[PDB]
Every structure is written in C-alpha cells, then in structure tokens.
Design an enzyme around this catalytic site. Structure first.
Site, PDB file in Angstrom:
ATOM      1  N   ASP A  16      -4.528   1.158   6.602  1.00 37.24           N
ATOM      2  CA  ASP A  16      -5.612   0.175   6.578  1.00 37.24           C
ATOM      3  C   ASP A  16      -5.470  -0.733   5.370  1.00 37.24           C
ATOM      4  O   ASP A  16      -5.612  -0.295   4.224  1.00 37.24           O
ATOM      5  CB  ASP A  16      -6.949   0.929   6.585  1.00 37.24           C
ATOM      6  CG  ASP A  16      -6.859   2.247   7.344  1.00 37.24           C
ATOM      7  OD1 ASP A  16      -6.259   2.265   8.445  1.00 37.24           O
ATOM      8  OD2 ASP A  16      -7.349   3.266   6.805  1.00 37.24           O
ATOM      9  N   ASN A  31       0.828  -1.211   0.000  1.00 38.93           N
ATOM     10  CA  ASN A  31       0.000   0.000   0.000  1.00 38.93           C
ATOM     11  C   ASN A  31       0.856   1.251   0.000  1.00 38.93           C
ATOM     12  O   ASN A  31       0.753   2.120  -0.857  1.00 38.93           O
ATOM     13  CB  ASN A  31      -0.892  -0.030   1.240  1.00 38.93           C
ATOM     14  CG  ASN A  31      -1.632   1.263   1.504  1.00 38.93           C
ATOM     15  OD1 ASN A  31      -1.674   2.172   0.686  1.00 38.93           O
ATOM     16  ND2 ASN A  31      -2.249   1.341   2.674  1.00 38.93           N
ATOM     17  N   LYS A  74      -0.300   9.124   1.332  1.00 42.44           N
ATOM     18  CA  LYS A  74      -1.699   8.690   1.466  1.00 42.44           C
ATOM     19  C   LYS A  74      -2.489   9.991   1.608  1.00 42.44           C
ATOM     20  O   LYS A  74      -2.372  10.653   2.633  1.00 42.44           O
ATOM     21  CB  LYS A  74      -1.872   7.820   2.688  1.00 42.44           C
ATOM     22  CG  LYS A  74      -1.255   6.429   2.588  1.00 42.44           C
ATOM     23  CD  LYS A  74      -2.211   5.503   1.805  1.00 42.44           C
ATOM     24  CE  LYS A  74      -1.629   5.230   0.438  1.00 42.44           C
ATOM     25  NZ  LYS A  74      -2.423   4.293  -0.387  1.00 42.44           N
TER      26      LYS A  74
END
Lengths: 269, 269, 269, 269
Positions: free
Chosen positions: B237, B25, B59
């Site tokens: 997450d 991620n 992010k």
C-alpha cells in the site's frame, strides 16, 4: 483556477506575490497606531510587498468585564481615517456586532469575521450585504472543507470578494497545530478563493519565523501578522507578537521564500 | 547547537544542506530496486544533493499472514549489496527483530527503528550495540519532547549517532497532521540531533510536493521519500508514492528551498 | 463542596438526584410544543425526576439565511408562557443577542449561553445582570479547566447561579468524543458548580441510551436531552433526537442508574 | 449477537456479568503476588464476580536498559504456577517476544498482545497458533473499527478466542481520552467479540472509581484493573494503581452497576 480578490490596486490570489496583512492586536492609542503603521509601511514599500494594515477597535472576548477592550468603534474609525490620510494604507479590521458592519465598511477596505462568530448567520449576512471584501477567520474547531459552506453563505448575499484565513486547529486541550495540507483543501472547497495564514494566532514566540516560512512554502495568497514595539508591555497579551524591530528581517525572508515558491512550475504529481 | 551525524562522507545536520533519504517502500524485486536506485542516483548526482537509498526488506505489519511482505532479510541484503557494488550508494533499512541487527548493520549504513517498536528496550539496545547510525521513527502518538528520552536510552548503550524522523501525529481517528513546530521541539529535546521529515508517510499524491517544501522551509536535516515506477501497481500500500518521472522536478524544488532557507541569517535577533 | 443551584423548588447539585433538562431542538409549533412538554411532564411526574423543559426560539447559526430558524422571540415567549400556564413547567432557552436577555429572563427560569458565544463578554454580562440561572454550554474546543474562568466572569457580574453543560470535545476533523474525566475537572475548577451532560449534541442514534448511562454513572447534576414525535420529519435536522415514545424507558434507566450511583459512599482512593 | 469466550468455567461476553481481570502491574515478588492474588480472590469470591488474575513477568518498554523490569519468564511462570496451585486462579499475562508465546500459553489461561505490538504479524500469528485465549490491547492510536482487522488476522491463524481491551485514545500530546462510544463500534466490527475496559491505563488517580463505573455503564464484558498494597512505592511507577485496601468497596460498586445495566431490556430508539 484561483480567484483574484482586489483590494484597491492590490491583487490577492494564491498564485500572485503574497500580501502582508500586518499590524497590531488592538488600537492601543492613536500614537502607537501611527508608529506601528509607519514601521510596516517603511518595510513593505522598501521590499515591494503589497500591504494591508490590521488592528482591532474592540476586544470582544477578554477575561473580565473590566478588561481593556480597545477604543471602541467611533474612536477606532477616527484613528483608521488618520492612517488612511497619513500613509494611504489599506485597512483590515474585525467586527463583532451586526450594527457595526456598515459604518466600519464605509471606512476600511476589508472586514473580518471573527472565528467564534463565523456561523452566526445574521452577522455573516450583514457583513456580506455591505459589499466589502471579507476575511473569514477559520474556527480552530472547523474542518478546512467546511469553509466552502461559509463562502456559499456570503456569496448568496451577493458578495464574492472573500479571503479565507487559517489560524491553526485545536489539538487536544489548550493546544494548537497548523495543518499545512488544509490550505489546498480550503482552495478546493472555495473554488479558488485566496487563502492566507495567520501565524500569530497559530502559536498556541521564537518559532514565528520558521512557522511563517513553512506556511508560505505551501503557496498561499498572504500572511496575517501582529507586531508591537515592546510586546511585553502590550495592553492585550501578544505572546507571539513580533517585536517591531524584527519586521524588516522577517518580511525579507518571506518575500524571498514566496518569490521562490511562486516561480516553481507545477509538478505533475 | 546542532549535532553532526556522519554517514561515510555525508554529513547530516539541522544547519547543513538537506540529505535525501529516498527510495521505495519495499524491495519488490532486484530489478525494480536497481531501477529505482539508478533514478535517484542520476537526479541527486546532477543536482549535488547528498543521498541515502531507502527500502524495507520485510513488511512486518501486513494485514494477513498470507500478504506479500518483501523478500526477507537474506535476499534483501543481497540486493542491497548489489546496489552498493554498482552505484556506491549509502543505504538505510528498517529492522524489526533483535537478531537482524548485526547481520543488517554489516551491510547497510543506517538502521531504522520502526515507530511501533520505538520503546521496545531490547531492540533499541541490540541496534545501538551494532554501532550503526540509527534513524528513530517518531510514533504518531508520541510528543516531540519524548524523543529526548529515546535519545538518552540509546546513548546509554554507547551509541550517539542518532537521527530523528517525524512522520506526523495522530489527529482524531484514522488521520494524521504534521506539526511543523515539533521539529524545533525535537531539536531542543535531543540537544541538537538531526531531524528529518518523512513526507510520504505523513500523508495519512498531489500534496507531497507542497508538504515537502513546507517541511524543508522550517530548516531541517533531511527528507525521507518513497517513489515507484508505477505507483498504482506497487505490491504494498503506497497511498502517497511519487512517480519516478517526477523525481528530478521534486528534488530541484527541495534543493532550491533548502539552499534558500539555510542561507538566511538567523532572524532570531 | 458542591454548590446547590435552585430552579424554583428544584435543587440542582452534583450529589443530588439528577435533573432532566429535556425538550426539543426548536419550538416548531405551539401544538408540537404542548405535545412534547406533556410527554415529558407525564414521564417525569410518574417517575419522580426533577424536570426543566427546553427548546430554542431561534436557531442563530443556521445552514442558510432562509432555512427554518424557529418562531422568533416574540412568538416563542408566547409559547413558553402558555407552557408555564398549562403545565407549570420550569423552562430553559438559549439567547444569542444582548437585547434578548431581559425579555427572555422575564418569562423563562434558565437562560443558556450558546457554546460558540461562551467567551463573548457583553452577552455574558447582559445575561448575568438579569439574575436568571445561567447554563453555560462548554464549547467543543475549550478545556474543562477553562470553565473556571467563565464562572469567575459571571460571578464578577453579581450572579453565582451557574450550571455547566458538557456537549463533547472536538476529536480530529468533524468528530466528537466525550471526556468522562472532564466532569471532575469542571467541578474542581468551578469550586463545585453543578455539571450536566448534553447527550444529544455529543453524538456528532442507537447509542444515545448507553452514552447517557455512562455520563450519569460518573455522578453529575443532570442530563440535557432532545426528543421529537417524528425525528425524521423535524424541521431542524435532529439525527440524534430521541423518538418521543422511548422517553419513559429512557428516563426509567437514568433514574435507576443515578439513584444507585448517588447511594454509594464515597470511595477515597 | 455476542460471542461467548470461555476461560475455563468462566463465560466472557458483552451481555453476561462482567469479569474482573484484576491484579498488579508486574510480579514484584512471590510474596507480593500471593498477597495481591489473595485479596482479589477473597473480594471476588465474597461478591460472586468472575475473576482472572493479571500480572506481567517482564516490562519490555522501561526508560533505561538498567531499569527494573520484572522477574523474567522463567521465574514469572514459576510464580504463576504457585498461584494456580494455591488459589486455583485463572491467569492473564502479556508476551512481547515470539519465542515466549508457547511456554507462556502452557501455563496461563489468556495471553495479552501488547498495544504497541498489536500489528506485528509474526507475533500475532505465534500467539494465535498456541490456541490460547487472546486479549488484544487496543493501541491508543487505533480507531475502534480497526479492531475488526486484528480479529480477522487472528481468525485466519485458526484461533477465534479473542477479547478486545480498550485503554483510551490519544488526545493531543501526552493525554488520553476514553471514547465510550468506541465499545459498540468494536463490538460491531468484531461481529460480537467481548469488549473489556482497562481503566488503569486509561488514566493519563482519584477518578479510577468514577471512570470504571462509566465504562461498565455502557454494558461491556469486563474490567481490567491494577492495584498495589502500597502504590507510591511500587517498583515500577503505577500512578493510577488502586490501593489494595479499596478493592472491596470498588468491586462492590462495579457489581451493582453491572448487574443493573445488564438487567435492562434493550431500548428501541
């Protein structure tokens, strides 16, 4: 643990070779039924794919009271008995009225509970009381987890020979999407009942093959498919009905995919 | 027909061996970036699967102004450069602000247009002007046909190296479904642009493998995947990230199913 | 051009004062029926709102085969007859089987086609041939424009006395949304048939009142409502039944909203 | 309990008279802005409805880099200053780039966070730091309860002056439905922030008036509307813009409905 549902000498399960529940939309004539069954029997015996012939004897929800509805129960059962005698095939058909369950179960191998009637309690009990193998069509407006309730309803009537069939889910108005994650949700909710994929009714076509491959890639018990010699002249409308001549090629790809996926060891995920 | 988009010596196309756009991620640290990249390189080299390393450097939609959001562009590009120098890997990352396009395109091979920003015209133009390959993330609220508009908008800026990436579509509140029929629709709308499936972000886990197989069974140009040494301890997450340990087995399945499907004669007729 | 459907001395039409189709889910007991019916007659008489009492005699889509499903047609028709003799109320009830249409239409004024059975041809025809006013419940999966096809089907049977009823539309798994724009579409597709809103079944409730005001603000022919003396003890789950004591305040708001809306000169935009 | 957000001498709150946030899609020209603003001021001052003028200075999502997209910030802020000088109006506008937040907030009363950018943390923080009142456009793919999270993110930046605006929710491909039940979910999730309804962008029309009435019938803090003197000739497509000439009749209905609904005591159910 996957349940094994037996249809004569056919074993249906999520981890066994897929079963082709294949036929036509409705029994248009005795002659077309014989031709369609013969074509599927030739392809499946050749490839070595377990097969169940499908056809409706009545079309309960057509647009007009004058619409073509199929031959009706008595004539449809005569045609089914001819197919059994001639080809020795196993047969699946749907029932729409409570009084038809027993007479139809005395002739076919599997009775199908139409999606629109899936919750009609008297109909579900009458079908389970026959003791036949039951195919539950999941309503397009039902969550995959809700199939657990229907299984319980059928099992409480003493019948556990249950197969679950996805035909896609409503997506906005007049449109359908197939939730590929739903097959394992149904497996989990039913404690392992075989799950099959109705590709024909999932197509809101040129994409029948890729959608069918996508479904089998998940690892499922079977494929539900409708075909016709010349789809455009079909009595009922089968816009996603497969041309009979593409059956051999189509089923060949499905056995290849299925065989490959069933050979995979589970991945620790 | 199908367009071929080049990433150095990697050819990405709907009828070519699938490309694995695999990574993590976010770039949690240089150490973890090296660990993750090394694992994917080992697996993809061994199996013979084209590979592009993916990670975000920022992010831009965390829940608080105080949330961990990555190392930022300067440190992120330093990490990317070390992976290139060490493993010779091709790299994809996402960009969120106009100013980042130039500096980022000088280091990575593909720049990704985030799904929330897919219709932000100035960002689309800045990205296109860099001349980098562009990966368009299909918003969960956009129809697959609409991707043809984004392709035209980018091509009007003089860049035709476009890959389209599905990550599922909204289904009710807080839930996603993957429309496997949308891949063909995107191919048609884009006049053959390569279509890739982001499996990890389509999982609104034990279902990543099945869903990935189902996507590749359709016949697509690639798969986008995120993994982590210890998924439950990831900084951001990652509901659905794959353990690094499961990579070899996962990739082995994808290659087998992709080779199988890419070898099928066009069933069309 | 709005159609006017008559229920005895009641005129039902999209541009007329709204009619309240109100009652209970099922006829739990003779005494409870008398109590609920009296509460509604008292309120509607006092406020001057046209009223039709509603209740089911059988719950055909129960949770289990043995859980409570109502008194059955024989006792139910006796209770309905007592309500008419006592209060002189107009009555609506649903029918689920072909055989019930004639006996039920001999007692009640309006026969309702259950949503799940909306496309069952044989049932539609048996209901239509009775000559009773027919209330069509729109399935949660049907688009508003498709109500026009069902109107044509009933008209082919010789009955044009049709009312359309919205109860919300599926939104993702196990959830419903009411499309307030669907009322206009149903009006146009049916060539002006009266459209009514079933607020209690649209709520999967503290929001029943605001949702009902929202529906009536569109400008429609009626509201369908279920209430109970003790909602928490109802034999049948009625999470959204209105407490009987809230009826006067509820109907008072509805008449005020409806009257206001119906007073506005049409604004062509 | 409901929060009261002040816009100068206007109080915005779910239980206070609705506020009309009315204007046009984009500042097409200084003369048209003056024309539109005068029309709204005359109607709202005549009727006694609180008013805030809306218009965008830039369209950041047009289909081509060559598409008309408004006057831009500098010229747009000049037009806003003339509207304040001439009519004394309160102004709302949207911002799409971080750098624009402060200059825009020095001129207008409310800054709007575009739906597509509702989760971009750096833009949210920049807007919040200006101290301006913020209108949050709910994304078509976000559930109503997730608005609580945006409120929290903004409050963490030291700004509590937040308004929440519904513009409908995705329903299948290329279609929207307005969930009227969403309003009370958003109120609860935000601990009482004022909720407004954008009827114009909720129209996927001849139904703008009935849908607006339906949203105000729920009991909300405001309505967001676009109009144009000659709609089919707007520089930017505005399929659902209300013709300017219909404003008085439209606002007259909204004031009547809102005054009625706000006069009802809460019904205990």
């Amino acid at each position: 643990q996957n349940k094994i549902v037996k249809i004569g000498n056919i074993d249906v399960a999520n981890d066994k070779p897929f079963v082709l529940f294949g036929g036509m939309n409705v029994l248009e004539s005795r002659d077309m039924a014989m031709q369609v069954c013969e074509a599927y029997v030739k392809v499946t015996e050749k490839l070595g794919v377990p097969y169940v012939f499908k056809a409706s004897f009545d079309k309960a929800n057509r647009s007009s009271i004058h619409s073509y509805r199929g031959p009706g129960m008595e004539e449809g059962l005569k045609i089914f008995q001819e197919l059994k005698d001639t080809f020795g095939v196993k047969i699946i058909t749907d029932v729409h009225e409570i009084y038809q369950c027993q007479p139809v179960a005395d002739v076919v191998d599997i009775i199908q509970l139409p999606a629109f009637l899936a919750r009609q309690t008297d109909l579900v009990e009458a079908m389970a009381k026959t003791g036949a193998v039951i195919n539950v069509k999941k309503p397009q407006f039902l969550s995959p987890s809700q199939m657990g309730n229907i299984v319980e309803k059928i099992e409480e009537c003493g019948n556990d020979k249950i197969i679950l069939c996805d035909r896609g889910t409503n997506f906005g108005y007049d449109n359908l999407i197939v939730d590929m994650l739903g097959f394992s949700v149904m497996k989990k909710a039913s404690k392992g009942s075989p799950v099959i994929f109705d590709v024909t009714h999932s197509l809101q076509r040129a994409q029948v093959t890729e959608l069918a491959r996508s479904g089998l890639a998940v690892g499922i018990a079977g494929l539900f498919l409708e075909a016709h010699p010349n789809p455009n002249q079909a009595k009922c409308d089968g816009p996603s009905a497969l041309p009979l001549s593409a059956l051999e090629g189509f089923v060949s790809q499905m056995k290849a995919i299925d065989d490959l996926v069933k050979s995979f060891p589970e991945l620790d995920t």
